[PDB]
Design a protein around this ligand. Structure first.
Ligand code: CDL
Ligand code: CDL
Ligand code: CDL
Ligand code: CDL
Ligand code: PLX
Ligand code: PLX
Ligand code: PEE
Ligand code: PEE
Lengths: 347, 56, 98, 53, 459, 55, 140, 121, 69
């Protein structure tokens, strides 16, 4: 792809997301989603192969169906109240349609199936984009209409997402599918607190994006897409594997790391309500994500796997292009828990 | 002789300086809790004609 | 609510189910997507015509424009799938199973 | 989530089309213009929670 | 008390800037200085705590634990520098960093003044320990041992976090002083029953209770020597400290709740003491000994009498010292013969006499010989239990008999008899090992000279 | 009988077995969008007649 | 929907074990039918008759579990003269677990289902008595 | 949710004019020192990742890291303090304007309140 | 030892009272804040939880080509 065309497509994706965020009109939000999808499809197919075509097709079909449902919900809301402004969503049937449309755009269970397949079929850069930037617009829309959101449906989908992400991640050897399942579980954690406090949702979003950016940038630095290809990295880049292990621990949620803070705040916010059982189940289920993170850490940093002879030639060459902000993302992804009260600048 | 031995053993002052700094920080911390100094019902005492604080 | 509104909403639901159910050819699913656009256009136009909102008369035009954008996107993807496999069968799109 | 750039800059990117009582071409009125303006006026400034009841 | 916290954070860069052959010397010297400094916390008042700042405080229950931690770090440094000789300088500094971070988290844990900060540090202690075990262990079971250690803890400790945030939302604070002064009785409700379980089960798992005690043999056997030392000496006492702190809110619910835990503790006392009689592995024998002693501490904390609490504090300190010494003694033989089987190397008293008397004194303090602090704590707990119920003496009595039995069995098996003929690589004991044994054992006797320093706030 | 068999069986081995079974069930999908969108239709139908009816 | 659960809950705890058992078996049948729908959607049976066989198997197992649970819990509540007690729900849950183990023809499944279903039913009864909310309404 | 819509609020200000009536955080604030520590750690990780002498490779870029983190942290702390001050102001005003919802109860002494006693034995 | 290393009991006593006062004030403030949040979310009369409504400045008050609007 031409660099100019690639830059234009990336800016069109970003402009669609910004249009979703800055619009007070339902039609303009729909147009932002459609522009985002239109520019997003080629980026997944930047490196051409049958798997990339499959991922692009599946992503397009899922997002197009979601756009259908979103427009239908908008039209029903217009029919029952001649309002075009993104607000309380005066009709409950339209609200259910909108909730399922946005959940299927996000990948929340039971609509989670598309995410592992699309993440595995594309490169690591497109996977980074898909799992970080493509979550902002649906979550922004969900935040704007959280007053009319139904707790029973949203909490059911969030708990389902946490359970399914934890379970599906256990079976995975490929790194992209592991990241997709962890993304699903984090999405569930984000949307569980949505009807109670959207500031906690935004905080979890920012922490998850920081950790995900760090992890994808580490996986791009060490060109590893499977468990055993990452098992070789210690023989060339031990510091990278150590940083990856600390980032994985942070992803798991163990204190005093940055990852612990979002769950800690969500649990506190839910227990400010009555809501005792559900946070308990959420933590006991996040234990599964911690387990397969630890499996990755065992394979990559805490043990030394056998290497090959040709690594001696790689020993003589440096990493050509260094991605900026990798150091910053690692630090923000690990050592930020003492700055927890600064979340008050988010509401 | 001083230069090389100093560049070799400058690390032995980090822990004593850390302890001194910790003592100073403890002083700064406990000078912020003087809201009841010489105001307790059990230790309320008339100030001597030369001092100004019962404890620092 | 009138009865024509029932008919349009039933048309939308039928097209959505038809899209959801997959038989063999991808082309038929794109037909169902375009039918869903058609139903949404008709519903929007009827509501917009009934209560005299003048400024929303343009949004069905924009809806059709972005419908065409989706149709072109789907056709390009179908071209590439057929080039890879020689048929537009969804059964072939199973590489990401493993 | 919602960044109100329009309100900050006073732009009116899409607010002209949100309601039936807002400056239609040739002053053509909506079918329920009076009801909508009454609801908006009564509703205005009290917040969403108070407004429903 | 930043005069202790900041010198450890200064141990960090001093280690990371020391030259390659001076890391052990610098670490040992300055850790010993830090322990000398921390020894000043033993000047406790008799009525209230030592409230340093808004976030840190100290009473006579946490001061001996702090002194034990600060004293244990140099011992672990001495014990570690033998099996890490071939290790590169960077990973040696990493190991020392892990130990220093563990000390820092422990030091802040015993003095955190509100329950959430205590919880955060309590669980932060898990990361350095896990890294140590699963990175510097020797065998292939270290991975599974680390997994057990991590997940047993987290499964019991997440409900504690939920209960803590619920308690603060209901009462408004979690500062220990406010919690104690504003305490109110718990009603006999299912909600209260489950809140009691959520508050208690994390510390039960950490003690560990006999049931959930499986992680302990795996973790202590697969860990390197310093990991075993810190696990047996300090990390088991976090649960006891947490119970002695959290229990004030729980009463009067504890009276009808503590029954299953008391029964589990006593019968598992008997069971785990009987297990040591048939252990073919030395480290597993020491681990099960730890399980039985900590079951005694659980009984003491549950029955909640002043004598119970004094005995529990004394037993926690005494067991920390004794188990650390026993693990170091076993590791000396392991480094000699590269196997943990008890009957492999026999008759070691003939070849290593001074190490044999170290073994004798360790075994004597393990089986609670008077007037050691081990027996002071055990006897105080036994008297409290006899007051609780006169039938406890039978169970307590049985345990004493089995404890003496396996302690002397271990001593006789390893030290007496005739030396195995084939092994000829038993070198004379080094000065480092003898100094390490002496530095474990001298504090125990000096402490029985002045026993009020480890008897807790109820004294 | 107690430590090496039954205490192992109840808490950790049961947990591992159940989690492994659930992981195998959840993850092993055919990869075909036909089944996925059939599941989507079932989910949508359930949501409309359950959560939605009770306004 | 939840009208089944209202028809179950509108019956007093220790009265009319037949009606309570009917409501319980209706709930079980609905759950098994939903599970069958998802299983057929995600794992096709390769023929129509094998699919209806799987649907009938799952639905019958779930309906039998629900019927046994409801009948046993109601009978235990009324014979013991102790309603508002989670022990009746525990007994019903273990009876349902034994039913599941018999349906799958496995002793281990039967014992595990006994324990876990009894615990779950006891917790549900405790939540009914105390007022625990699975899906708490936002109140702050 | 709770603070998203408030009267007289500029959308993207990040620091309203009424925030200048609050004491600014001191330059020796421990949170600012922690932000500077985060900058130093970022600089060290940057040195280590690029295979450079970790402590001494780039002093100018490490200084830039530290000052950038401190600079962002100062305004972050200002906004944090402003939002907490707004929370307390609103809560106090709401308590004052609704007296019947926050009534001052009668003061009782421990000599009058009857607490049940639970013996430990 | 007492003169060189320690202080009198008055210092610790009064520091303890100061700390206790701070924590008790924080606890009562937290409970009050929770109650205020509950009341504002229930009623909507407070500054907090004010959901947006349609601005009346958008309404066109002009003759509408039909007298009945
Ligand atoms: C008050 C309510 C009561 C409780 C309700 C809540 C509890 C529900 C329990 C259901 C548990 C879920 C799984 C069941 C077992 C696994 C499936 C299976 O194969 O079973 C065969 C298994 C033995 O057969 P097998 O041949 O050995 O197993 C085959 C292989 O092992 C392997 O088999 P397989 O590979 O073919 O697996 C099947 C296949 C297919 O996977 C499934 O089976 C899906 C099942 C999930 C449905 C959940 C049901 C909950 C319904 C709630 C509403 C009820 C309305 C009333 O799996 C997959 O392909 C992947 C699964 C995961 C992917 C995502 C699926 C999740 C979809 C979303 C869940 C529900 C969404 C709801 C709405 C969402 C909108 C937000 O067991 C059975 O015989 C079936 C019976 C199951 C027991 C049901 C117990 C009912 C008790 C009711 C008592 C009521 C008393 C009175 C109350 C007052
Ligand atoms: C506004 C929002 C709302 C929007 C949504 C609104 C939707 C409603 C409007 C829809 C209007 C329909 C107009 C066009 C639809 C397009 C159909 C299409 O394109 O077909 C493609 C699709 C692909 O076929 P193909 O690839 O060309 O041929 C290859 C073979 O088909 C496959 O090859 P094979 O032979 O090797 O495979 C083995 C065999 C295997 O065959 C089977 O295994 C099926 C046997 C299942 C037994 C059913 C249960 C029996 C007993 C239940 C009793 C109920 C309660 C009674 C009391 C309890 C009793 C104990 O075939 C299958 O695998 C087919 C399984 C899928 C069945 C149909 C999926 C529908 C939903 C899932 C139902 C699952 C049933 C479980 C129970 C559900 C709850 C009752 O065709 C089919 O799947 C076959 C059936 C299609 C004809 C009927 C379609 C109408 C269904 C529409 C929705 C259902 C009713 C909604 C009403 C809602 C109330 C208003
Ligand atoms: C925390 C500290 C430490 C605690 C942890 C350690 C302790 C707890 C864990 C250990 C025990 C729990 C294990 C659970 C059962 C495991 C079964 C299993 O894994 O399945 C796979 C395993 C093999 O898989 P498979 O391929 O499907 O079967 C092929 C067989 O190998 C081929 O077998 P077969 O063809 O030769 O014959 C099969 C058939 C024929 O049966 C036999 O072959 C032999 C008979 C075995 C059971 C029948 C009972 C006869 C002896 C009992 C006499 C009185 C005992 C003392 C009680 C009074 C105390 C004064 O079996 C039956 O029909 C028996 C039906 C069950 C009736 C028993 C009812 C007992 C309820 C408990 C009442 C008392 C509670 C205590 C209250 C005390 C209050 C002071 O199944 C079996 O072989 C076992 C079946 C027999 C069940 C034994 C369970 C009874 C023990 C008490 C359980 C209660 C503890 C837990 C409470 C909650 C449970 C509901
Ligand atoms: C709470 C209190 C404070 C604690 C805060 C947290 C800890 C501190 C901050 C952490 C971040 C800071 C540094 C991060 C980047 C450093 C990376 C590195 O490798 O360093 C190498 C570097 C030595 O390398 P070199 O000299 O260039 O030449 C040798 C080759 O480079 C040799 O290169 P190589 O290729 O041969 O290296 C291979 C090696 C390299 O692998 C590594 O080195 C591991 C990298 C560390 C991961 C950091 C991730 C982010 C930080 C998270 C920390 C988590 C803390 C929470 C607790 C959980 C623990 C995980 O990998 C392996 O061999 C595999 C071993 C697998 C072990 C798995 C465990 C690793 C994770 C543990 C992290 C725990 C914190 C460690 C902090 C220090 C570590 C250097 O270390 C240093 O020299 C820097 C140390 C600190 C410098 C401070 C000195 C300033 C001036 C001193 C005076 C102080 C003030 C004066 C005023 C007083 C008035 C007079
Ligand atoms: C491996 C080691 C694990 C650790 C072991 C921890 C043990 C935890 C057990 C906790 C003991 C107390 C819990 C229940 C309190 C009362 C006991 C029960 O019998 O209640 C009776 C009531 O009768 C029935 O038993 C009710 C409970 C029925 C349901 C419980 C069955 C659970 C089966 C045991 C499973 C094993 C536990 C481990 C799970 C993994 C008492 O009658 P009543 O005075 O009116 O009620 C008192 C409580 N009130 C006042 C709040 C209402
Ligand atoms: C690991 C931590 C991740 C942090 C993520 C990146 C950190 C740097 C953030 C970049 C700073 C620039 C962003 C904005 C600066 C000027 C723009 C200004 O207008 O923003 C206003 C205010 O600024 C931003 O809103 C707040 C950004 C502050 C981010 C830092 C908080 C991190 C959370 C706590 C973790 C501790 C981090 C410590 C430092 C590393 C917007 O007001 P408003 O239009 O009304 O908000 C609409 C959306 N709402 C109401 C739903 C919120
Ligand atoms: C609602 C659901 C709640 C979920 C509760 C999750 C508890 C957290 C523990 C998760 C452990 C999951 C282990 C697992 O699934 O895999 C089994 C695993 C498969 O081996 P692999 O390494 O994946 O493959 C390598 C060979 N090719 O088998 C093992 O070896 C197990 C080893 C570690 C097991 C550790 C389990 C410790 C459990 C302690 C109790 C806590 C359980 C949590 C709930 C508490 C009880 C109420
Ligand atoms: C090594 C493995 C150890 C695992 C042990 C983990 C379980 C610990 C025991 C239970 C922990 C969960 C308790 C929940 C948090 C407590 C909060 C609380 O008590 O508040 C109660 C809430 O109480 C509950 O909701 C409790 C619900 C329990 C659901 C979680 C199920 C966990 C499994 C239950 C049985 C197993 C527990 C014991 C097992 C011991 C380990 C073997 C009051 O809230 P309200 O709703 O407002 O009610 C009064 C106002 N009307």
């Amino acid at each position: 792809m031409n660099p100019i065309i690639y830059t234009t497509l990336i800016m069109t994706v970003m402009s669609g997301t910004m249009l979703v965020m800055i619009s007070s009109h339902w039609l303009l939000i729909w147009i932002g989603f459609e522009m985002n999808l239109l520019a997003m499809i080629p980026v997944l197919m930047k490196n051409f192969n049958p798997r990339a075509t499959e991922a692009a097709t599946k992503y397009f079909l899922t997002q197009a169906t979601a756009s259908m449902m979103l427009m239908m919900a908008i039209i029903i809301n217009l029919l029952y109240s001649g309002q075009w402004t993104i607000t309380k969503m005066f009709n409950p049937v339209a609200m259910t349609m909108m909730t399922m449309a946005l959940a299927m755009k996000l990948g929340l269970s039971p609509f989670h199936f598309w995410v592992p397949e699309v993440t595995q079929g594309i490169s690591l850069q497109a996977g980074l984009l898909l799992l970080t930037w493509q979550k902002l617009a649906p979550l922004s829309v969900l935040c704007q209409i959280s007053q009319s959101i139904n707790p029973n449906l949203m909490l059911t989908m969030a708990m389902l997402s946490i359970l399914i992400g934890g379970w599906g991640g256990l079976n995975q050897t490929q790194l992209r599918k592991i990241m997709a399942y962890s993304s699903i579980a984090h999405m569930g954690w984000m949307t569980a607190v949505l009807p109670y406090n959207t500031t906690m949702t935004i905080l979890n979003l920012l922490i998850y994006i920081t950790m995900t950016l760090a992890m994808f940038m580490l996986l791009i630095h060490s060109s590893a897409t499977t468990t055993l290809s990452l098992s070789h990295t210690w023989n060339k880049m031990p510091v990278i594997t150590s940083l990856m292990m600390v980032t994985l621990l942070s992803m798991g949620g163990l204190p005093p790391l940055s990852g612990f803070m979002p769950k800690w705040m969500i649990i506190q916010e839910m227990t400010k309500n009555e809501s005792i059982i559900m946070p308990t189940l959420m933590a006991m289920t996040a234990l599964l994500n911690l387990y397969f993170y630890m499996r990755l850490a065992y394979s990559s940093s805490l043990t030394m796997f056998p290497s090959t002879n040709n690594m001696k030639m790689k020993w003589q060459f440096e990493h050509t292009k260094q991605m900026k902000l990798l150091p910053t993302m690692i630090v923000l992804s690990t050592l930020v828990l003492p700055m927890t009260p600064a979340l008050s600048s988010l509401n | 002789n001083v230069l090389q031995i100093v560049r070799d053993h400058w690390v032995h002052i980090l822990v004593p300086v850390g302890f001194v700094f910790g003592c100073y920080l403890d002083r700064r911390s406990d000078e912020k809790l003087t809201a009841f100094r010489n105001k307790s019902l059990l230790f309320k005492r008339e100030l001597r004609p030369n001092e100004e604080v019962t404890w620092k | 609510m009138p009865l024509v509104y029932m008919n349009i909403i039933m048309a939308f639901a039928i097209a959505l189910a038809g899209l959801l159910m997959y038989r063999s050819h991808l082309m038929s699913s794109l037909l169902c997507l375009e039918g869903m656009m058609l139903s949404l256009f008709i519903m929007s136009t009827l509501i917009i015509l009934n209560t005299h909102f003048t400024l929303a008369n343009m949004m069905p035009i924009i809806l059709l424009v972005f419908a065409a954008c989706e149709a072109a996107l789907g056709l390009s993807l179908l071209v590439m799938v057929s080039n890879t496999y020689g048929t537009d069968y969804v059964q072939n799109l199973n590489l990401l199973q493993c | 989530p919602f960044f109100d750039v329009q309100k900050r800059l006073g732009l009116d990117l899409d607010r002209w089309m949100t309601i039936q009582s807002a400056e239609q071409p040739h002053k053509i009125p909506g079918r329920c213009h009076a009801f909508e303006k009454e609801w908006i006026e009564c509703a205005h400034g009290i917040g969403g929670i108070r407004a429903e009841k | 008390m930043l005069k202790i916290i900041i010198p450890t954070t200064m141990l960090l860069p001093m280690t990371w800037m020391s030259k390659h052959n001076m890391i052990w010397i610098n670490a040992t010297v300055h850790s010993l200085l830090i322990s000398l400094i921390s020894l000043s916390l033993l000047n406790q008042l008799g009525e209230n705590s030592l409230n340093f700042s808004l976030t840190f405080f100290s009473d006579s229950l946490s001061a001996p634990l702090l002194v034990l931690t600060t004293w244990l770090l140099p011992l672990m440094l001495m014990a570690s520098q033998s099996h890490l000789s071939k290790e590169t300088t960077t990973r040696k500094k990493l190991y020392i960093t892990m130990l220093i971070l563990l000390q820092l988290f422990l030091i802040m844990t015993f003095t955190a003044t509100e329950l959430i900060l205590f919880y955060i540090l309590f669980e932060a202690t898990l990361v350095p320990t896990l890294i140590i075990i699963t990175r510097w262990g020797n065998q292939t079971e270290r991975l599974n041992a680390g997994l057990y250690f991590l997940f047993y803890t987290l499964a019991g400790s997440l409900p504690l976090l939920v209960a803590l945030v619920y308690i603060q939302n209901t009462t408004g604070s979690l500062n220990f002083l406010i919690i104690h002064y504003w305490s109110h009785p718990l009603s006999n409700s299912w909600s209260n029953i489950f809140m009691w379980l959520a508050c208690i089960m994390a510390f039960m798992v950490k003690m560990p209770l006999y049931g959930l005690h499986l992680w302990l043999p795996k973790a202590h056997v697969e860990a390197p020597i310093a990991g075993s030392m810190v696990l047996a000496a300090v990390l088991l006492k976090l649960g006891g400290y947490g119970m002695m702190r959290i229990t004030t809110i729980l009463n009067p619910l504890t009276n009808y709740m503590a029954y299953p835990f008391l029964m589990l503790s006593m019968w598992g006392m008997i069971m785990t003491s009987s297990i040591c009689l048939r252990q073919t592995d030395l480290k597993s024998l020491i681990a099960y000994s730890s399980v039985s002693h900590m079951a005694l501490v659980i009984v003491a904390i549950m029955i909640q009498t002043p004598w119970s609490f004094m005995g529990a504090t004394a037993l926690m300190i005494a067991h920390g010292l004794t188990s650390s010494m026993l693990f170091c003694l076993a590791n000396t033989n392991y480094e000699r013969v590269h196997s943990r089987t008890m009957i492999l190397a026999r008759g070691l008293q003939t070849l290593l006499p001074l190490m044999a008397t170290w073994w004798l004194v360790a075994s004597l303090t393990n089986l609670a010989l008077p007037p050691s602090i081990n027996l002071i704590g055990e006897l105080f707990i036994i008297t409290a239990s006899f007051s609780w119920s006169n039938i406890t003496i039978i169970l307590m009595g049985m345990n004493m008999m089995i404890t003496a039995l396996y302690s002397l069995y271990m001593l006789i098996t390893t030290q007496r008899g005739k030396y195995t003929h084939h092994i000829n690589n038993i070198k004379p004991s080094f000065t480092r090992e003898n100094a390490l044994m002496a530095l474990h054992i001298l504090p125990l006797l000096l402490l029985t000279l002045n026993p009020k320093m480890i008897l807790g706030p109820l004294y | 009988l107690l430590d090496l068999i039954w205490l192992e069986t109840i808490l950790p081995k049961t947990t591992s077995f159940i989690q492994m079974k659930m992981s195998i069930m959840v993850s092993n999908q055919k990869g075909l969008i036909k089944l996925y969108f059939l599941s989507f239709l079932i989910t949508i139908m359930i949501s409309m007649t359950l959560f939605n009816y009770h306004e | 929907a939840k009208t089944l659960l209202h028809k179950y809950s509108d019956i007093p705890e220790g009265t009319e074990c037949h009606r309570k058992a009917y409501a319980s078996t209706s709930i079980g049948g609905a759950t098994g039918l939903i599970v069958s729908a998802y299983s057929i959607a995600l794992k096709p049976p390769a023929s129509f008759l094998e699919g209806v066989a799987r649907t009938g198997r799952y639905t019958f197992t779930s309906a039998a579990i629900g019927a046994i649970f409801g009948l046993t819990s109601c009978i235990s509540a009324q014979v013991r003269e102790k309603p508002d007690d989670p022990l009746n729900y525990f007994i019903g849950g273990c009876a349902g677990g034994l039913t599941l183990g018999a349906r799958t023809r496995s002793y281990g499944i039967g014992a595990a289902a006994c324990a876990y279903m009894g615990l779950t039913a006891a917790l549900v009864k405790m939540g009914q008595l105390e007022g625990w909310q699975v899906f708490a309404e936002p109140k702050v | 949710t709770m603070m998203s819509g408030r009267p007289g609020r500029v959308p993207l200000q990040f620091l309203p004019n009424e925030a200048r009536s609050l004491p600014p955080p001191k330059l020796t604030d421990p949170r600012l020192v922690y932000m500077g520590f985060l900058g130093y750690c970022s600089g060290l990780i940057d040195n280590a990742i690029r295979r450079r002498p970790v402590v001494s490779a780039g002093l100018h870029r490490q200084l830039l890291y530290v000052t950038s983190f401190v600079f962002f942290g100062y305004y972050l702390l200002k906004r944090q303090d402003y939002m907490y001050a707004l929370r307390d102001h609103d809560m106090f005003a709401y308590v004052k304007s609704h007296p019947e919802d926050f009534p001052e109860k009668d003061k009782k002494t421990y000599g009058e309140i009857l607490e049940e006693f639970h013996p430990v034995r | 030892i007492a003169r060189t290393f320690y202080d009198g009991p008055e210092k610790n006593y009064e520091k303890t009272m100061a700390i206790l006062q701070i924590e008790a004030e924080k606890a009562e403030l937290r409970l009050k804040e929770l109650e205020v949040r509950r009341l504002m979310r229930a009623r909507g009369d407070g500054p907090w939880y004010q959901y947006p409504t349609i601005d009346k400045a958008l309404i066109d008050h002009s003759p509408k080509t039909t007298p009945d609007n």
